Amino acid sequence: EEDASQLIFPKEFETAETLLNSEVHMLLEHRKQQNESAEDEQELSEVFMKTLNYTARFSRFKNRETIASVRSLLLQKKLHKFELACLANLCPETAEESKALIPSLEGRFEDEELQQILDDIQTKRSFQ
Amino acid sequence: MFYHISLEHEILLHPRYFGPNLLNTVKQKLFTEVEGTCTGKYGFVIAVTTIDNIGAGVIQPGRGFVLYPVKYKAIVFRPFKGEVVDAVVTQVNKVGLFTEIGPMSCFISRHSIPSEMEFDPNSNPPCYKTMDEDIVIQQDDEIRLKIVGTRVDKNDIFAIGSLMDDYLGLV
Amino acid sequence: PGGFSEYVLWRKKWHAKGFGMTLKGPNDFKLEDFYSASSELFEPYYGEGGIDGDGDITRPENISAFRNFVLDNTDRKGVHFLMADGGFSVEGQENLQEILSKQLLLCQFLMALSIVRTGGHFICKTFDLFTPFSVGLVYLLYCCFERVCLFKPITSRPANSERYVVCKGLKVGIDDVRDYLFAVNIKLNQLRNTDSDVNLVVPLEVIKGDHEFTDYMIRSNESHCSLQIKALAKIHAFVQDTTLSEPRQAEIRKECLRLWGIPDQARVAPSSSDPKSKFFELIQGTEIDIFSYKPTLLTSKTLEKIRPVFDYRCMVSGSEQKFLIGLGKSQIYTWDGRQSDRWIKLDLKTELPRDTLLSVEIVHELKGEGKAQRKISAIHILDVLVLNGTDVREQHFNQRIQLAEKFVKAVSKPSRPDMNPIRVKEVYRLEEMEKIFVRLEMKIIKGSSGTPKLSYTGRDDRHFVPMGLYIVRTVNEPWTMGFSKSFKKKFFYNKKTKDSTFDLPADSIAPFHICYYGRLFWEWGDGIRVHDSQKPQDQDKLSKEDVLSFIQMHRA
Numbered sequence: 001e002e003d004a005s006q007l008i009f010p011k012e013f014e015t016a017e018t019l020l021n022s023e024v025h026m027l028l029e030h031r032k033q034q035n036e037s038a039e040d041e042q043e044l045s046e047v048f049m050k051t052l053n054y055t056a057r058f059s060r061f062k063n064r065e066t067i068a069s070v071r072s073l074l075l076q077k078k079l080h081k082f083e084l085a086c087l088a089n090l091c092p093e094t095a096e097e098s099k100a101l102i103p104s105l106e107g108r109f110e111d112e113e114l115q116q117i118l119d120d121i122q123t124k125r126s127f128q
Numbered sequence: 129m130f131y132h133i134s135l136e137h138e139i140l141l142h143p144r145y146f147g148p149n150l151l152n153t154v155k156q157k158l159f160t161e162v163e164g165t166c167t168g169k170y171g172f173v174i175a176v177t178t179i180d181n182i183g184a185g186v187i188q189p190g191r192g193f194v195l196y197p198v199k200y201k202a203i204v205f206r207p208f209k210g211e212v213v214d215a216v217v218t219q220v221n222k223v224g225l226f227t228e229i230g231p232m233s234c235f236i237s238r239h240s241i242p243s244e245m246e247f248d249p250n251s252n253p254p255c256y257k258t259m260d261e262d263i264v265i266q267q268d269d270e271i272r273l274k275i276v277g278t279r280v281d282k283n284d285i286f287a288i289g290s291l292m293d294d295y296l297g298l299v
Numbered sequence: 300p301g302g303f304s305e306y307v308l309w310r311k312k313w314h315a316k317g318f319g320m321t322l323k324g325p326n327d328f329k330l331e332d333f334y335s336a337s338s339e340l341f342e343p344y345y346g347e348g349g350i351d352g353d354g355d356i357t358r359p360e361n362i363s364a365f366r367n368f369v370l371d372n373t374d375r376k377g378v379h380f381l382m383a384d385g386g387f388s389v390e391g392q393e394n395l396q397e398i399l400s401k402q403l404l405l406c407q408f409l410m411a412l413s414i415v416r417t418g419g420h421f422i423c424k425t426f427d428l429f430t431p432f433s434v435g436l437v438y439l440l441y442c443c444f445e446r447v448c449l450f451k452p453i454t455s456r457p458a459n460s461e462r463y464v465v466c467k468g469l470k471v472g473i474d475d476v477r478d479y480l481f482a483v484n485i486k487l488n489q490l491r492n493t494d495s496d497v498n499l500v501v502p503l504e505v506i507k508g509d510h511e512f513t514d515y516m517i518r519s520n521e522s523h524c525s526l527q528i529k530a531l532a533k534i535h536a537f538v539q540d541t542t543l544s545e546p547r548q549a550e551i552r553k554e555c556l557r558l559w560g561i562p563d564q565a566r567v568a569p570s571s572s573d574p575k576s577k578f579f580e581l582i583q584g585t586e587i588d589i590f591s592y593k594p595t596l597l598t599s600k601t602l603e604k605i606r607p608v609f610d611y612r613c614m615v616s617g618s619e620q621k622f623l624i625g626l627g628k629s630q631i632y633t634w635d636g637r638q639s640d641r642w643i644k645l646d647l648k649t650e651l652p653r654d655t656l657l658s659v660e661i662v663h664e665l666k667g668e669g670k671a672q673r674k675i676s677a678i679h680i681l682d683v684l685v686l687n688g689t690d691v692r693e694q695h696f697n698q699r700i701q702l703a704e705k706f707v708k709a710v711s712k713p714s715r716p717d718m719n720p721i722r723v724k725e726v727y728r729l730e731e732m733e734k735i736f737v738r739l740e741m742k743i744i745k746g747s748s749g750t751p752k753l754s755y756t757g758r759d760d761r762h763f764v765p766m767g768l769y770i771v772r773t774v775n776e777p778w779t780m781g782f783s784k785s786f787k788k789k790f791f792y793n794k795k796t797k798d799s800t801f802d803l804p805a806d807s808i809a810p811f812h813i814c815y816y817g818r819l820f821w822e823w824g825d826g827i828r829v830h831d832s833q834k835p836q837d838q839d840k841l842s843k844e845d846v847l848s849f850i851q852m853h854r855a
Binding site for chain 1: 129130131132133156163164165166169170172173174175177203205206208209210211212214216228229230231270272274275293294295
Binding site: 249250251252253255257261262263264266268269270298299 | 647672675676677716718719
């Protein structure tokens with residue numbers, strides 16, 4: 001009934017606002033720091049640790065200012081939240097790969113503009 | 129996709145657990161009950177971002193505990209059909225492939241894996257590799273899988289990945 | 300099924316490494332039935348294709364492939380000796396046994412000339428040697444070795460044509476004979492199922508020109524003929540009379556076993572011992588707490604512990620240290636040194652002989668970089684206590700490492716690229732730790748998001764991520780090694796008696812428990828600079844420069 005290839009989401013996931021992997025890492029590390037202080041509170045869930053380490057391994061934007069810059073550059077583009085987050089997380093390098101990993105980008109943007117956006121992504125990717 | 133949404137949950141506070149500070153008890157209760165949970169309609173409940181609104185406490189007639197409807201910003205995740213997601217390989221098997229997306233276990237069957245990526249127990253880590261041995265998918269790798277679909281279940285949305293389409297496999 | 304190798308391996312334990320080739324099928328090698336040994340002691344190689352070959356020794360492809368394999372695993376010198384015992388059914392045409400197996404005999408002699416090192420030995424089973432073809436082959440062996448004889452042991456049944464040719468001392472410059480016999484075998488393969496055949500390899504006039512050789516050959520043939528005739532008539536008489544018997548078989552067998560040093564005890568002991576009981580058996584009452592000692596971390600506060608420098612050796616670590624016990628074949632178990640921990644079966648495709656006790660780490664070896672990188676799990680041996688039954692814990696550390704390279708070279712797998720490799724760690728002298736940092740490189744590892752990671756490259760083109768460096772003391776209590784500037788040689792000094800000697804004192808030897816207890820570990824985590832490309836030098840952590848400067852100040 002649902003299909004992420006054509007943005008087929010349930011009615012519950014209509015107001016769903018996406019998050020970046022670096023955003024999740026930063027917020028969950030802030031939660032972990034809160035857990036470090038404010039004693040008489042036990043450890044968080046195994047889900048918390050797994051998600052935190054998983055998004056720490058796959059983090060691509062090492063700076064919150066980088067997060068803000070990417071969000072500002074992509075939010076002014078005519079994209080859905082899901083497409084925006086998927087592009088900012090997978091980070092493709094060729095427009096063909098951008099349209100292949102996300103088949104809902106077929107015709108949304110011009111492939112030259114899409115390649116410009118991908119080059120902007122590779123420009124704003126905090127390398128390691 | 130990692131989501132930032134607002135969710136509504138009701139907390140039952142019994143009079144023995146009121147205390148001098150009542151709202152902090154409710155906040156601890158919410159951080160206890162829903163963190164790390166998983167629902168079929170909202171996915172993996174990762175964490176609660178900010179407890180926004182605390183509703184009026186309705187004393188249940190006959191019952192002693194008060195009921196608090198609570199609205200809270202929350203970070204969650206939900207696997208989707210056809211979404212290409214990065215993953216960490218945990219085990220390579222002759223039947224399938226055990227990978228992880230956050231806390232989610234993803235099983236990619238070899239039947240939906242192209243004929244190039246053959247299985248080899250003969251390498252010391254049993255791995256997926258081609259006869260050219262260019263793409264070597266093994267344990268603790270960074271790969272990408274297009275989710276065929278997910279088994280939505282009680283506190284579990286474990287997914288099934290795909291490698292059939294283009295640009296799928298090792299990063 | 301490698302009975303010869305079963306004897307040799309049972310007698311030499313881990314102190315021998317064997318290479319075997321035989322025909323695939325019902326008469327293939329049975330490694331799992333060896334009283335001792337393992338797959339990584341007697342390593343089969345079946346010709347072209349390696350372990351996927353058919354093992355036919357009469358094929359030139361298999362000959363060249365097995366020769367290259369044996370040379371690649373013997374420092375290109377060859378084996379110390381070769382044994383060949385080839386045969387097959389000649390039922391219905393038994394009298395033509397020598398002719399029907401002429402090519403097998405030629406190929407076995409040729410394999411001797413192909414893989415046996417200079418001064419090496421060679422024993423081969425033959426049959427009747429009436430034809431000039433076989434006699435010429437024996438003459439070639441007699442020209443190629445320093446001494447040859449024809450012998451029939453009493454364990455060879457007296458009524459058959461079986462005998463053995465024993466050759467010692469392969470001469471230098473036998474390569475022309477080797478090439479010649481290779482060519483003759485090729486011609487033999489080309490004349491199969493035809494009316495032609497190679498009937499001479501050495502002219503009859505050359506053989507008969509040597510009167511001594513011909514005299515010995517004729518006398519051997521005739522004495523064997525008379526003995527075999529008597530035995531055959533004896534079997535015939537025992538057919539025509541079933542009451543006749545030798546009443547002396549039991550006593551003769553007893554005396555033979557006593558003479559040859561073969562204990563009169565059966566194989567039947569599957570040693571289905573659990574790893575814990577076998578570990579207690581192998582340590583022979585040594586205190587178990589010795590195996591629980593953690594290494595002393597090398598810090599600025601503990602740097603003075605390595606002050607002697609010459610007393611110490613060092614090696615690069617790639618994982619946490621573990622103990623490993625081998626119960627035979629794939630029954631290999633590991634233990635992390637704590638009394639509370641259980642022995643865990645090792646999930647690696649590798650084999651090792653029974654009664655083996657090792658100090659190891661399980662390393663992830665990497666070949667190539669980036670997306671093309673292949674990864675392999677390997678057993679890296681740090682030290683050895685017992686191998687295949689003989690204890691070595693009291694021998695000097697370098698000697699234990701050399702016996703480890705002995706067994707470990709033996710416990711390897713070139714014919715089975717499908718098996719997990721076993722290696723010895725590269726052991727460096729502490730006053731030569733500078734050589735270690737030259738092998739440290741920053742390489743892009745699969746899954747590091749593009750970040751280069753510190754990597755130590757070994758003797759082959761594989762590398763692993765180092766966790767640190769172990770420092771192991773090899774000289775015992777109040778015994779230490781200095782360097783004499785007048786004699787330009789290292790010497791041993793006794794701190795209690797004040798004696799000095801240039802030879803190794805027996806009591807200066809550090810046994811395994813001293814080496815294990817006194818070991819230090821220099822961790823190589825974040826903030827530690829050991830390669831010039833990674834300088835987040837935490838000022839509280841020892842760098843490569845600090846340790847090297849301390850070592851240099853205390854070499855003099």
